[PDB]
Amino acid sequence: MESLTQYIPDEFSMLRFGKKFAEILLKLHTEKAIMVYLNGDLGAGKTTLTRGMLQGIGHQGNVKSPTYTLVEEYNIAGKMIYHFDLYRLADPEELEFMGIRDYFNTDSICLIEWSEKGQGILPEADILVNIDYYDDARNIELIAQTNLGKNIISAFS
Ligand SMILES: [Hg+2]
């Protein structure tokens, strides 16, 4: 219900943009946390973005592949933070398992990938992030299905 498209020529643009995205994120608190869905062909500016988001904040380290696992978490400038890889998940059983850990409450920004499996426990996202990519560069609509999404996008001008 609110779209927004952005051109990303190379690395450093995924990072300005990656990191530019989150501070908007960080200024508004949460009743039900800020859903944010990551979506592209594997290897299309996914991780690059993710890091861009976390290290554009104060993550001195590495974004640990959330592969062998599911939710790797952080906590930054008055916000907890959780990456999610839903790839090795077929059963949402395992989605019901972390959420019981204070992941959806006050001060919680959950950023998730492979949302196919996150249809049950897993909420619907305020900001649907879809990332285009051909030869060198990338594209990305910042679309918002809900009300936080309508105004998180709007935050970019
Ligand atoms: Hg979450």
Taking the C-alpha atoms of residue 23 and residue 97, their distance in angstroms, rounded to an integer, is: 29
Residue 5 among known ligand-binding residues: no
Q: Give the phi and the psi of residue 36 in degrees, each rounded to 5.
A: -145, 110
Tokens of 98: 């972390």
Which is it for the CA torsion 127, 47, 133, 23, positive or negative? Answer: positive
CA atoms within 13 A on the CB side of 142: 23
Please report, in angstroms and rounded to a whole number, the separation of the first and last CA atoms in the chain: 18
Taking the C-alpha atoms of residue 5 and residue 71, their distance in angstroms, rounded to an integer, is: 28
DSSP-based three-state secondary structure for 82? strand
Method: X-ray
The partner residues of 132 in beta bridges, in order of sequence, read 139
Kindly report the CATH number assigned to the domain that includes residue 68. 3.40.50.300
For residue 135, how far is its CA from the centre of ligand 1 (angstroms)?
A: 32
Taking the C-alpha atoms of residue 28 and residue 42, their distance in angstroms, rounded to an integer, is: 30
Taking the C-alpha atoms of residue 25 and residue 34, their distance in angstroms, rounded to an integer, is: 8
Q: What is the number of structural domains in the chain? A: 1
Give the domain extent around 42.
1-157
Give resolution, Å, one decimal: 2.5
Residues for the chain: how many in total?
157
Residue 125 among known ligand-binding residues: no
Closest CA to 45 of 82, 3, 93, 9: 9
Closest CA to 23 of 68, 72, 77: 77
Tokens of 78: 């008055």
Residue 78 among known ligand-binding residues: no
For residue 117, how far is its CA from the centre of ligand 1 (angstroms)?
A: 13
Closest CA to 119 of 92, 140, 144, 155: 92
- Asked whether the beta carbons of 40 and 133 are under 8 A apart, the reply is yes
